[PDB]
Design a protein around this nucleic acid. Sequence first.
RNA 1: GAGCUAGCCCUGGCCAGGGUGAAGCUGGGGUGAGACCCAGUGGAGGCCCGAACCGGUGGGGGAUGCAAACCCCUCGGAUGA
RNA 2: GAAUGCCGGCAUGAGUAACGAUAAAGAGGGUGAGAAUCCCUCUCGCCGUAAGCCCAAGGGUUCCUACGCAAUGGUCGUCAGCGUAGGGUUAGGCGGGACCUAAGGUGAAGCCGAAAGGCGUAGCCGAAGGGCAGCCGGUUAAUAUUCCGGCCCUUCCCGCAGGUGCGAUGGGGGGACGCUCUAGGCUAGGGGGACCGGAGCCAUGGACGAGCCCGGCCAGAAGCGCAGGGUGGGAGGUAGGCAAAUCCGCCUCCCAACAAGCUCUGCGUGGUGGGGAAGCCCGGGUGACAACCCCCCGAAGCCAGGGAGCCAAGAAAAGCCUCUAAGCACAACCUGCGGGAACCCGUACCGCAAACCGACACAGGUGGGCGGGUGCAAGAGCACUCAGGCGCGCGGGAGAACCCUCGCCAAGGAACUCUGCAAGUUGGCCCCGUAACUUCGGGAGAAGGGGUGCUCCCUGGGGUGAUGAGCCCCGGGGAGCCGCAGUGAACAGGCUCUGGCGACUGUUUACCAAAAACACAGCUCUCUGCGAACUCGUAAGAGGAGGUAUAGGGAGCGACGCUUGCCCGGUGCCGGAAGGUCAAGGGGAGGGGUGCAAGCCCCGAACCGAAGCCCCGGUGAACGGCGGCCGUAACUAUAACGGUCCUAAGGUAGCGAAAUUCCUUGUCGGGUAAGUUCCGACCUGCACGAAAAGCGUAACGACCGGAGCGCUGUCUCGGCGAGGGACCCGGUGAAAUUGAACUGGCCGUGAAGAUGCGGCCUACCCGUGGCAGGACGAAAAGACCCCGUGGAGCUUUACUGCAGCC
RNA 3: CGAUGUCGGCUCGUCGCAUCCUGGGGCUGAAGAAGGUCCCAAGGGUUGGGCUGUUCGCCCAUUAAAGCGGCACGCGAGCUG
RNA 4: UGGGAGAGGGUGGUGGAAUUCCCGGAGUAGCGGUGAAAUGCGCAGAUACCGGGAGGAACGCCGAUGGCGAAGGCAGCCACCUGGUCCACCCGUGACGCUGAGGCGCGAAAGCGUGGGGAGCAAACCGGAUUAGAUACCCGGGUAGUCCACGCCCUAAACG
RNA 5: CCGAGGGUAGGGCCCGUGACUGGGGCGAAGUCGUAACAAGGUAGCUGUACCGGAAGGUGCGGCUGGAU
Lengths: 275, 48
Amino acid sequence: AVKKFKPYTPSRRFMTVADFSEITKTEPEKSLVKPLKKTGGRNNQGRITVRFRGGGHKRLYRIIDFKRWDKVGIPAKVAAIEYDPNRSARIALLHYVDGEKRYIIAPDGLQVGQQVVAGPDAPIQVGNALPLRFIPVGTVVHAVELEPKKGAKLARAAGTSAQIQGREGDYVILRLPSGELRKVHGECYATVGAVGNADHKNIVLGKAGRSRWLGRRPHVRGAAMNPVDHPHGGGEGRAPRGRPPASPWGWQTKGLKTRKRRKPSSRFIIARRKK
Amino acid sequence: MKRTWQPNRRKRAKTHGFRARMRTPGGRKVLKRRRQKGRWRLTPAVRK
RNA sequence: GAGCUAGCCCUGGCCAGGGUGAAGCUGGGGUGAGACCCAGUGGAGGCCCGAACCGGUGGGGGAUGCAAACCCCUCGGAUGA
RNA sequence: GAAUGCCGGCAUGAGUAACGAUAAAGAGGGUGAGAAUCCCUCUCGCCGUAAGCCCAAGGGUUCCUACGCAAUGGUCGUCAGCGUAGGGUUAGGCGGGACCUAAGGUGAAGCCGAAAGGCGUAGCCGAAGGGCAGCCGGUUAAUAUUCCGGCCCUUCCCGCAGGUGCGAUGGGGGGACGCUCUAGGCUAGGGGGACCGGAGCCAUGGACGAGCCCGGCCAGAAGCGCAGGGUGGGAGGUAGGCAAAUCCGCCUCCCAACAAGCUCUGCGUGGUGGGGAAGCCCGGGUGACAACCCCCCGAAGCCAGGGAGCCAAGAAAAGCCUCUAAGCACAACCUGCGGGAACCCGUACCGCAAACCGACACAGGUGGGCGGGUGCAAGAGCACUCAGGCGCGCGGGAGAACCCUCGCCAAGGAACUCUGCAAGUUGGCCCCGUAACUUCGGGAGAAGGGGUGCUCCCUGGGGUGAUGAGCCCCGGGGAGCCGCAGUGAACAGGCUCUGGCGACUGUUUACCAAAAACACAGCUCUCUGCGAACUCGUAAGAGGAGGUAUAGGGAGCGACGCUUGCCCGGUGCCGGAAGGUCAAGGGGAGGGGUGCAAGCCCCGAACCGAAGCCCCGGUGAACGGCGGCCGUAACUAUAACGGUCCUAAGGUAGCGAAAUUCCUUGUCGGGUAAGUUCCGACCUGCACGAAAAGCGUAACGACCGGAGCGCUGUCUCGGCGAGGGACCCGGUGAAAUUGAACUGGCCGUGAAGAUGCGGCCUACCCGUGGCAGGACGAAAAGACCCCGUGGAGCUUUACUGCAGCC
RNA sequence: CGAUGUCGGCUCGUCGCAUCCUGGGGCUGAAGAAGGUCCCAAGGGUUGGGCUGUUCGCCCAUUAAAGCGGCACGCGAGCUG
RNA sequence: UGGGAGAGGGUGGUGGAAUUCCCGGAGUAGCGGUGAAAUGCGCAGAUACCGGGAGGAACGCCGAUGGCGAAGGCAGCCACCUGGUCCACCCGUGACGCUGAGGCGCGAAAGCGUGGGGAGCAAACCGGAUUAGAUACCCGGGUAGUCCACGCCCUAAACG
RNA sequence: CCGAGGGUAGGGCCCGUGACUGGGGCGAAGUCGUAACAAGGUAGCUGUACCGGAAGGUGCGGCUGGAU
Ligand SMILES: CC[C@H]1OC(=O)[C@H](C)[C@@H](O[C@H]2C[C@@](C)(OC)[C@@H](O)[C@H](C)O2)[C@H](C)[C@@H](O[C@@H]2O[C@H](C)C[C@H](N(C)C)[C@H]2O)[C@](C)(O)C[C@@H](C)C(=O)[C@H](C)[C@@H](O)[C@]1(C)O
Ligand SMILES: [Mg+2]
Ligand SMILES: [Mg+2]
Ligand SMILES: [Mg+2]
Ligand SMILES: [Mg+2]
Ligand SMILES: [Mg+2]
Ligand SMILES: [Mg+2]
Ligand SMILES: [Mg+2]
Ligand SMILES: [Mg+2]
Ligand SMILES: [Mg+2]
Ligand SMILES: [Mg+2]
Ligand SMILES: [Mg+2]
Ligand SMILES: [Mg+2]
Ligand SMILES: [Mg+2]
Ligand SMILES: [Mg+2]
Ligand SMILES: [Mg+2]
Ligand SMILES: [Mg+2]
Ligand SMILES: [Mg+2]
Ligand SMILES: [Mg+2]
Ligand SMILES: [Mg+2]
Ligand SMILES: [Mg+2]
Ligand SMILES: [Mg+2]
Ligand SMILES: [Mg+2]
Ligand SMILES: [Mg+2]
Ligand SMILES: [Mg+2]
Ligand SMILES: [Mg+2]
Ligand SMILES: [Mg+2]
Ligand SMILES: [Mg+2]
Ligand SMILES: [Mg+2]
Ligand SMILES: [Mg+2]
Ligand SMILES: [Mg+2]
Ligand SMILES: [Mg+2]
Ligand SMILES: [Mg+2]
Ligand SMILES: [Mg+2]
Ligand SMILES: [Mg+2]
Ligand SMILES: [Mg+2]
Ligand SMILES: [Mg+2]
Ligand SMILES: [Mg+2]
Ligand SMILES: [Mg+2]
Ligand SMILES: [Mg+2]
Ligand SMILES: [Mg+2]
Ligand SMILES: [Mg+2]
Ligand SMILES: [Mg+2]
Ligand SMILES: [Mg+2]
Ligand SMILES: [Mg+2]
Ligand SMILES: [Mg+2]
Ligand SMILES: [Mg+2]
Ligand SMILES: [Mg+2]
Ligand SMILES: [Mg+2]
Ligand SMILES: [Mg+2]
Ligand SMILES: [Mg+2]
Ligand SMILES: [Mg+2]
Ligand SMILES: [Mg+2]
Ligand SMILES: [Mg+2]
Ligand SMILES: [Mg+2]
Ligand SMILES: [Mg+2]
Ligand SMILES: [Mg+2]
Ligand SMILES: [Mg+2]
Ligand SMILES: [Mg+2]
Ligand SMILES: [Mg+2]
Ligand SMILES: [Mg+2]
Ligand SMILES: [Mg+2]
Ligand SMILES: [Mg+2]
Ligand SMILES: [Mg+2]
Ligand SMILES: [Mg+2]
Ligand SMILES: [Mg+2]
Ligand SMILES: [Mg+2]
Ligand SMILES: [Mg+2]
Ligand SMILES: [Mg+2]
Ligand SMILES: [Mg+2]
Ligand SMILES: [Mg+2]
Ligand SMILES: [Mg+2]
Ligand SMILES: [Mg+2]
Ligand SMILES: [Mg+2]
Ligand SMILES: [Mg+2]
Ligand SMILES: [Mg+2]
Ligand SMILES: [Mg+2]
Ligand SMILES: [Mg+2]
Ligand SMILES: [Mg+2]
Ligand SMILES: [Mg+2]
Ligand SMILES: [Mg+2]
Ligand SMILES: [Mg+2]
Ligand SMILES: [Mg+2]
Ligand SMILES: [Mg+2]
Ligand SMILES: [Mg+2]
Ligand SMILES: [Mg+2]
Ligand SMILES: [Mg+2]
Ligand SMILES: [Mg+2]
Ligand SMILES: [Mg+2]
Ligand SMILES: [Mg+2]
Ligand SMILES: [Mg+2]
Ligand SMILES: [Mg+2]
Ligand SMILES: [Mg+2]
Ligand SMILES: [Mg+2]
Ligand SMILES: [Mg+2]
Ligand SMILES: [Mg+2]
Ligand SMILES: [Mg+2]
Ligand SMILES: [Mg+2]
Ligand SMILES: [Mg+2]
Ligand SMILES: [Mg+2]
Ligand SMILES: [Mg+2]
Ligand SMILES: [Mg+2]
Ligand SMILES: [Mg+2]
Ligand SMILES: [Mg+2]
Ligand SMILES: [Mg+2]
Ligand SMILES: [Mg+2]
Ligand SMILES: [Mg+2]
Ligand SMILES: [Mg+2]
Ligand SMILES: [Mg+2]
Ligand SMILES: [Mg+2]
Ligand SMILES: [Mg+2]
Ligand SMILES: [Mg+2]
Ligand SMILES: [Mg+2]
Ligand SMILES: [Mg+2]
Ligand SMILES: [Mg+2]
Ligand SMILES: [Mg+2]
Ligand SMILES: [Mg+2]
Ligand SMILES: [Mg+2]
Ligand SMILES: [Mg+2]
Ligand SMILES: [Mg+2]
Ligand SMILES: [Mg+2]
Ligand SMILES: [Mg+2]
Ligand SMILES: [Mg+2]
Ligand SMILES: [Mg+2]
Ligand SMILES: [Mg+2]
Ligand SMILES: [Mg+2]
Ligand SMILES: [Mg+2]
Ligand SMILES: [Mg+2]
Ligand SMILES: [Mg+2]
Ligand SMILES: [Mg+2]
Ligand SMILES: [Mg+2]
Ligand SMILES: [Mg+2]
Ligand SMILES: [Mg+2]
Ligand SMILES: [Mg+2]
Ligand SMILES: [Mg+2]
Ligand SMILES: [Mg+2]
Ligand SMILES: [Mg+2]
Ligand SMILES: [Mg+2]
Ligand SMILES: [Mg+2]
Ligand SMILES: [Mg+2]
Ligand SMILES: [Mg+2]
Ligand SMILES: [Mg+2]
Ligand SMILES: [Mg+2]
Ligand SMILES: [Mg+2]
Ligand SMILES: [Mg+2]
Ligand SMILES: [Mg+2]
Ligand SMILES: [Mg+2]
Ligand SMILES: [Mg+2]
Ligand SMILES: [Mg+2]
Ligand SMILES: [Mg+2]
Ligand SMILES: [Mg+2]
Ligand SMILES: [Mg+2]
Ligand SMILES: [Mg+2]
Ligand SMILES: [Mg+2]
Ligand SMILES: [Mg+2]
Ligand SMILES: [Mg+2]
Ligand SMILES: [Mg+2]
Ligand SMILES: [Mg+2]
Ligand SMILES: [Mg+2]
Ligand SMILES: [Mg+2]
Ligand SMILES: [Mg+2]
Ligand SMILES: [Mg+2]
Ligand SMILES: [Mg+2]
Ligand SMILES: [Mg+2]
Ligand SMILES: [Mg+2]
Ligand SMILES: [Mg+2]
Ligand SMILES: [Mg+2]
Ligand SMILES: [Mg+2]
Ligand SMILES: [Mg+2]
Ligand SMILES: [Mg+2]
Ligand SMILES: [Mg+2]
Ligand SMILES: [Mg+2]
Ligand SMILES: [Mg+2]
Ligand SMILES: [Mg+2]
Ligand SMILES: [Mg+2]
Ligand SMILES: [Mg+2]
Ligand SMILES: [Mg+2]
Ligand SMILES: [Mg+2]
Ligand SMILES: [Mg+2]
Ligand SMILES: [Mg+2]
Ligand SMILES: [Mg+2]
Ligand SMILES: [Mg+2]
Ligand SMILES: [Mg+2]
Ligand SMILES: [Mg+2]
Ligand SMILES: [Mg+2]
Ligand SMILES: [Mg+2]
Ligand SMILES: [Mg+2]
Ligand SMILES: [Mg+2]
Ligand SMILES: [Mg+2]
Ligand SMILES: [Mg+2]
Ligand SMILES: [Mg+2]
Ligand SMILES: [Mg+2]
Ligand SMILES: [Mg+2]
Ligand SMILES: [Mg+2]
Ligand SMILES: [Mg+2]
Ligand SMILES: [Mg+2]
Ligand SMILES: [Mg+2]
Ligand SMILES: [Mg+2]
Ligand SMILES: [Mg+2]
Ligand SMILES: [Mg+2]
Ligand SMILES: [Mg+2]
Ligand SMILES: [Mg+2]
Ligand SMILES: [Mg+2]
Ligand SMILES: [Mg+2]
Ligand SMILES: [Mg+2]
Ligand SMILES: [Mg+2]
Ligand SMILES: [Mg+2]
Ligand SMILES: [Mg+2]
Ligand SMILES: [Mg+2]
Ligand SMILES: [Mg+2]
Ligand SMILES: [Mg+2]
Ligand SMILES: [Mg+2]
Ligand SMILES: [Mg+2]
Ligand SMILES: [Mg+2]
Ligand SMILES: [Mg+2]
Ligand SMILES: [Mg+2]
Ligand SMILES: [Mg+2]
Ligand SMILES: [Mg+2]
Ligand SMILES: [Mg+2]
Ligand SMILES: [Mg+2]
Ligand SMILES: [Mg+2]
Ligand SMILES: [Mg+2]
Ligand SMILES: [Mg+2]
Ligand SMILES: [Mg+2]
Ligand SMILES: [Mg+2]
Ligand SMILES: [Mg+2]
Ligand SMILES: [Mg+2]
Ligand SMILES: [Mg+2]
Ligand SMILES: [Mg+2]
Ligand SMILES: [Mg+2]
Ligand SMILES: [Mg+2]
Ligand SMILES: [Mg+2]
Ligand SMILES: [Mg+2]
Ligand SMILES: [Mg+2]
Ligand SMILES: [Mg+2]
Ligand SMILES: [Mg+2]
Ligand SMILES: [Mg+2]
Ligand SMILES: [Mg+2]
Ligand SMILES: [Mg+2]
Ligand SMILES: [Mg+2]
Ligand SMILES: [Mg+2]
Ligand SMILES: [Mg+2]
Ligand SMILES: [Mg+2]
Ligand SMILES: [Mg+2]
Ligand SMILES: [Mg+2]
Ligand SMILES: [Mg+2]
Ligand SMILES: [Mg+2]
Ligand SMILES: [Mg+2]
Ligand SMILES: [Mg+2]
Ligand SMILES: [Mg+2]
């Protein structure tokens, strides 16, 4: 449940912060964090290839176990639930009876002190990772592999979830967080339940500086620029777009579909997305 | 005011130095070119 | 050619002093239990005043200048984009 | 002889401007050919969170000493950062290397590109980050944590003794981390003393005093003490840490538990070794057997890897410890002791500046540390001062105009002006008090007032100590004193009402614009299923993201509140397996050339044949657009109402002479003595209008308007005074400009505005201080404007191509 | 066009006279006072404010009067902007 | 003490019918709609039929003139949690009662906030008719909303 | 010392008046439609919402003070 502030500054009027009330441990596991090499949006050429990036808080990357089929049949206790500045969700620290320690994305409802497990034999319980073909039809799952053994690729963001709708052959039908209907292979892993921290979307940043804390530098509108810079530049005074609204590089940015038409995964897209 | 010349020995050697010039084609032509002209110095002297 | 300038990356450093007094916590009141009220404690903030520092608002001087952008008075920010 | 020609020489302006901060000078003595300028002394003044000191960068001998003054020095010069010559920089411990990693750079493997080359894991390189052993004093003209003295310590090799399963690039631990606030105890630093040490001093009316002046420490190994940091012990199991493992990790048991113990630091003490003032006497020497004690204030530093809270969630790697593997256990490693060994480079000097960056000995620029005392509420603010450093490398005079900076002003008080521009006013602290409105925070330092010094007297609590005295910190009450005036100097808001625009803190045209512009949290649309979209790249490869639709790209709007209407005909976009058109290709009716001929060779109809376009739909917070004439109400007027024409549909709510209104100073109302502005209304809106958003909105603004109070040299209307210049003398001595010049007025003439021509008038020759009307004065081959089949940026349903995409 | 700076203001004036006032006149539909209109006359004078960048104009309060023009729409090597 | 009846309330589950859409098959020239029509939909394969899937909302028969609640109101079915009520016994307390200005709470629908959901329905709106007009009634579309969670609003022909 | 009151600055309440504006009442014979009273020709009324020259219409839920 998001936390409001009294208006003792102009920005405190609307600024909201997470309640952080599910976190049980406040510093990262030394053996599972590594330096997160900030880019600024520059590539190996040195060129801004993604604009308005940089200047965020320093971060360490928590190594997250996106396979889990590494360790079929070895249970693990939920030792803690922690903050992770690299993703919307929270992360959960697992202590395996193996003695090994890993992080997973924290599903909604997971409690410290519960034991989770992974594999075809697993119970249909929050935090269990099974191949997709062994979860009953209708079960809400997250952290889903797109391809067998290739790694959890879908429904990783705070609050998201895919739902199992039915089966066809070696393949399952998932309703993704976008509402598309895609066929995913049955041997792909997924974790029972939805990701936690659903309140994440109701956060009200509150002021410009908070975006600067996330590495987000200011966006500059096309209309505010000059013709050397953007299709929407120029004009004496303000101005409407005066052409179909365009990106910096000329392409149209209202409705123009951009998925590649012959892409092979199209055989596996049953229906495009919702809303 | 702060002007354009802010001498820095390490910046000087690392930018115009002999080893900087040999590492690229345009650099070796510079050295060849200044050697053909008979420059007493092929490169800016910096004290390291 | 980025030793000027612009942005980002890595690593360090700096920000006198005062002022305001958020949540929280505690106690008291309240109630079926609450909400909530009062006091104290607390020390929040692109919060307030003001040096260093960063700026350059208005005026005056300067105009073969002390200076190819300076000087005086005044003025903005000063825990933060 | 001319090219605003080129190179050089030399003139003119001219003995003119200037001589670079208005911090300031005077005299005596010395030296010397020569002295305002060098040296010495006394007096004066300036900086003192600096204008003093120490590091770093950069500079590169500028350092020190002798000897010089042609040039350099804005004057001078005997001086000097100048000339000449000699001298000067000393390290196992400081900094860098023989150590580690960060971004980045490079790069065995590998990948990519016509060539050049671009990438790329490890690895390597890479520092002001990690790591690691030196403190105090003396010494030289010039170096010192470097030399010397004292007391300490590190690594490497070898040896000795004790001990132990020893052994690594491998496993593990640790190293290892944010922001704000902050505890306890110290230390640096400081204040005081009636105590201790000291050469002296008694003045000019008084004082021989509990007098004045001065100074009362620094470093130090073990131990010890105080304060802190760090750290569970044992056992059993064990599949995880890419081999192993007794280590680590996980599970159980026992024990311990604010502890303690073990360990590591700071501080204190400490053998020991140092230092040691004023004054006096020519840097030294004396003082001096110097003394070296007590109380108080007290860090931002130290203990430290301390504590708490918060969200934006805060390097790596080596050193180091531990585990074992090959191996090896005559080894090896650990521990203590002993001897020996310990290399390269930097070290002078300047360093907020005359030695660095600005062409200059240039009022500019330059990162880190130290930065004393008093008082002013605090402080790095302000004034004066310590240490220490300076008086800014032309002076002497005079005492005009005028200019700059500054002080005051009778009466009036914004009448000044585009504008209160500028300058007054106000000004700190303490107490009383404080409105509309509001998002309940604010608005608020609202506004407005009162207090403020000194003496005496009584008294409350706190810190140190002890619970006392002493010192130190916050106060309370009473009675008095002096002045024009008590934050008596210095630093230190004028206020209010009302509108426009932008929510706000921010950002910007380096060097004419700081704004209403950009940004901004927030809202909406749209694309994107991950080898994502999109971006950069020929590619490989990167960014996106070690992210995954609560995410990422693109676009518009811009907190918040109440809202965002009608038009899909056109353009865009999205959907549409029909149809229509449609390229290569397929097909080959049927024609052609040649050959004697088998043949060879050419043209070619229907038909099949993508995307795109046509066509059918949808789509507005997609591009965009949201009517005309005529009539009508029982006074007039105006039309709720009607007729008709056109449209894809004819502007809704709200707002309106407005940042928009042309006619315009619209009209009415308010404010004024008077109001082209302002505010409030009206609405025939030239030419508002709903996310190029509409109407509002508390708070905010060096934004832009209008008004009022306060107060003023802004003004009536100017006066006087100060200093720095201007002026005079000595020194040094520019400049743009310049066809030559023996260079007057009027009325005319002239290429149409004449010193230069005509006629007249006026006028002895040459300067100095002033003023700017002319020399179509100077500067810049007009930026406006046009011309050139000149150029460049930009746009699109101009042309033609290309990338990219299909 | 190898540059003649361009509105208004301020300051400083100088000139013309088709005279706004003051002096002298004729005519009057001049009783007086007051004007009306033409003539002569350029010696001097010709105010302070509100509004607007304004010139101009309107308005307020006075006045003998609140003149109109030229001087590169006089005057930016005199200022403003 | 012991009994019973009930859509009383709250939470979590879960069942079938029907509508809509989507996929496959089959099939052809209309379907839909009305007072009559047109708009609309349909050879680009609709309607009507069968198989499949998804999703939302409501709960047929029972059902009543019934029942429960203080009122507003409450209807598939299951479980849990909870309120009120009536009855038999005549067992306990000893008038502990009645009402109730203020207060507090509850309070249909619509409406508002921030998320979610969205089949059907449907203000606004668009089109087709009717009509003198038709900003209506009727028809074809259609957005809020109706649904869920939390938080507001607090109204009524909230009536017996 | 207190003190009539005078002055300065700021608040509260009432009264009168104001360009313009909002609906209200009244007014023998105005304009537009016809919402209600009969099943008033779509039963009406309702709270609310949205919309429209105007009465009103429509939605959602409620009442019978609805008809046959
Ligand atoms: C400070 C010192 C500078 O002087 C100025 O700024 C003055 C104040 C300008 O006026 C400024 C300010 C202003 C308002 O002029 C008054 C503006 O109009 C002009 C454009 O520039 C001048 C004099 C301009 O002249 C004017 O240029 C006009 C185009 C035409 C005009 N004249 C021939 C008709 C002429 O005199 C012009 C060109 O800058 C002068 C040229 C030679 C220069 O470039 C010189 C080197 C100047 O930079 C300067 C002397 O250093
Ligand atoms: Mg808040
Ligand atoms: Mg509040
Ligand atoms: Mg959480
Ligand atoms: Mg690590
Ligand atoms: Mg990267
Ligand atoms: Mg790279
Ligand atoms: Mg490169
Ligand atoms: Mg490059
Ligand atoms: Mg980009
Ligand atoms: Mg970027
Ligand atoms: Mg997280
Ligand atoms: Mg994320
Ligand atoms: Mg798959
Ligand atoms: Mg948000
Ligand atoms: Mg961040
Ligand atoms: Mg953003
Ligand atoms: Mg923007
Ligand atoms: Mg623009
Ligand atoms: Mg622009
Ligand atoms: Mg460009
Ligand atoms: Mg272009
Ligand atoms: Mg373009
Ligand atoms: Mg444009
Ligand atoms: Mg523009
Ligand atoms: Mg523009
Ligand atoms: Mg425009
Ligand atoms: Mg346009
Ligand atoms: Mg376009
Ligand atoms: Mg594209
Ligand atoms: Mg999709
Ligand atoms: Mg600069
Ligand atoms: Mg360097
Ligand atoms: Mg360097
Ligand atoms: Mg460098
Ligand atoms: Mg080099
Ligand atoms: Mg380089
Ligand atoms: Mg190379
Ligand atoms: Mg070569
Ligand atoms: Mg040579
Ligand atoms: Mg070179
Ligand atoms: Mg530099
Ligand atoms: Mg600060
Ligand atoms: Mg500060
Ligand atoms: Mg600090
Ligand atoms: Mg402070
Ligand atoms: Mg308090
Ligand atoms: Mg607390
Ligand atoms: Mg602040
Ligand atoms: Mg303040
Ligand atoms: Mg000023
Ligand atoms: Mg200049
Ligand atoms: Mg200055
Ligand atoms: Mg100043
Ligand atoms: Mg400030
Ligand atoms: Mg010639
Ligand atoms: Mg010349
Ligand atoms: Mg030439
Ligand atoms: Mg020449
Ligand atoms: Mg020459
Ligand atoms: Mg010459
Ligand atoms: Mg010569
Ligand atoms: Mg010469
Ligand atoms: Mg001369
Ligand atoms: Mg002269
Ligand atoms: Mg000069
Ligand atoms: Mg000068
Ligand atoms: Mg000065
Ligand atoms: Mg002298
Ligand atoms: Mg003297
Ligand atoms: Mg001599
Ligand atoms: Mg001399
Ligand atoms: Mg001399
Ligand atoms: Mg001198
Ligand atoms: Mg001397
Ligand atoms: Mg030099
Ligand atoms: Mg000389
Ligand atoms: Mg000389
Ligand atoms: Mg000589
Ligand atoms: Mg000289
Ligand atoms: Mg000089
Ligand atoms: Mg030396
Ligand atoms: Mg060696
Ligand atoms: Mg080459
Ligand atoms: Mg390197
Ligand atoms: Mg060292
Ligand atoms: Mg030491
Ligand atoms: Mg010597
Ligand atoms: Mg031995
Ligand atoms: Mg061992
Ligand atoms: Mg750590
Ligand atoms: Mg870490
Ligand atoms: Mg670090
Ligand atoms: Mg922080
Ligand atoms: Mg002190
Ligand atoms: Mg000691
Ligand atoms: Mg094991
Ligand atoms: Mg330490
Ligand atoms: Mg001594
Ligand atoms: Mg002695
Ligand atoms: Mg500090
Ligand atoms: Mg520490
Ligand atoms: Mg690393
Ligand atoms: Mg072996
Ligand atoms: Mg052996
Ligand atoms: Mg051992
Ligand atoms: Mg060596
Ligand atoms: Mg040295
Ligand atoms: Mg300086
Ligand atoms: Mg410094
Ligand atoms: Mg110097
Ligand atoms: Mg230069
Ligand atoms: Mg000098
Ligand atoms: Mg200087
Ligand atoms: Mg003070
Ligand atoms: Mg001086
Ligand atoms: Mg100075
Ligand atoms: Mg003089
Ligand atoms: Mg004189
Ligand atoms: Mg001065
Ligand atoms: Mg004074
Ligand atoms: Mg006066
Ligand atoms: Mg006044
Ligand atoms: Mg006055
Ligand atoms: Mg005024
Ligand atoms: Mg004004
Ligand atoms: Mg003042
Ligand atoms: Mg003051
Ligand atoms: Mg108030
Ligand atoms: Mg008020
Ligand atoms: Mg107000
Ligand atoms: Mg207001
Ligand atoms: Mg309030
Ligand atoms: Mg106050
Ligand atoms: Mg006050
Ligand atoms: Mg008092
Ligand atoms: Mg006194
Ligand atoms: Mg007195
Ligand atoms: Mg102030
Ligand atoms: Mg702003
Ligand atoms: Mg702005
Ligand atoms: Mg606005
Ligand atoms: Mg706003
Ligand atoms: Mg804004
Ligand atoms: Mg700020
Ligand atoms: Mg600028
Ligand atoms: Mg500029
Ligand atoms: Mg510039
Ligand atoms: Mg300026
Ligand atoms: Mg601007
Ligand atoms: Mg500003
Ligand atoms: Mg901007
Ligand atoms: Mg918004
Ligand atoms: Mg959205
Ligand atoms: Mg590209
Ligand atoms: Mg190529
Ligand atoms: Mg990555
Ligand atoms: Mg907004
Ligand atoms: Mg905004
Ligand atoms: Mg913006
Ligand atoms: Mg409001
Ligand atoms: Mg359209
Ligand atoms: Mg269209
Ligand atoms: Mg269409
Ligand atoms: Mg258009
Ligand atoms: Mg159009
Ligand atoms: Mg509307
Ligand atoms: Mg107007
Ligand atoms: Mg209007
Ligand atoms: Mg307006
Ligand atoms: Mg307009
Ligand atoms: Mg106008
Ligand atoms: Mg008017
Ligand atoms: Mg009036
Ligand atoms: Mg009108
Ligand atoms: Mg627009
Ligand atoms: Mg616009
Ligand atoms: Mg406002
Ligand atoms: Mg406001
Ligand atoms: Mg502002
Ligand atoms: Mg501003
Ligand atoms: Mg005023
Ligand atoms: Mg006034
Ligand atoms: Mg004056
Ligand atoms: Mg004077
Ligand atoms: Mg003389
Ligand atoms: Mg001379
Ligand atoms: Mg000279
Ligand atoms: Mg001649
Ligand atoms: Mg001549
Ligand atoms: Mg002459
Ligand atoms: Mg003459
Ligand atoms: Mg002529
Ligand atoms: Mg003439
Ligand atoms: Mg003449
Ligand atoms: Mg002649
Ligand atoms: Mg002649
Ligand atoms: Mg003549
Ligand atoms: Mg003549
Ligand atoms: Mg004459
Ligand atoms: Mg002279
Ligand atoms: Mg003169
Ligand atoms: Mg002149
Ligand atoms: Mg000329
Ligand atoms: Mg002239
Ligand atoms: Mg001239
Ligand atoms: Mg030329
Ligand atoms: Mg020209
Ligand atoms: Mg030119
Ligand atoms: Mg131009
Ligand atoms: Mg022209
Ligand atoms: Mg042509
Ligand atoms: Mg031509
Ligand atoms: Mg051309
Ligand atoms: Mg061109
Ligand atoms: Mg011209
Ligand atoms: Mg010329
Ligand atoms: Mg010229
Ligand atoms: Mg004036
Ligand atoms: Mg008469
Ligand atoms: Mg008369
Ligand atoms: Mg006459
Ligand atoms: Mg006259
Ligand atoms: Mg004019
Ligand atoms: Mg006018
Ligand atoms: Mg008269
Ligand atoms: Mg005139
Ligand atoms: Mg004329
Ligand atoms: Mg002219
Ligand atoms: Mg004219
Ligand atoms: Mg003209
Ligand atoms: Mg003129
Ligand atoms: Mg003029
Ligand atoms: Mg001028
Ligand atoms: Mg002018
Ligand atoms: Mg001139
Ligand atoms: Mg002149
Ligand atoms: Mg002239
Ligand atoms: Mg059809
Ligand atoms: Mg067919
Ligand atoms: Mg659905
Ligand atoms: Mg009984
Ligand atoms: Mg219609
Ligand atoms: Mg009809
Ligand atoms: Mg309700
Ligand atoms: Mg009639
Ligand atoms: Mg009726
Ligand atoms: Mg009816
Ligand atoms: Mg009817
Ligand atoms: Mg309707």
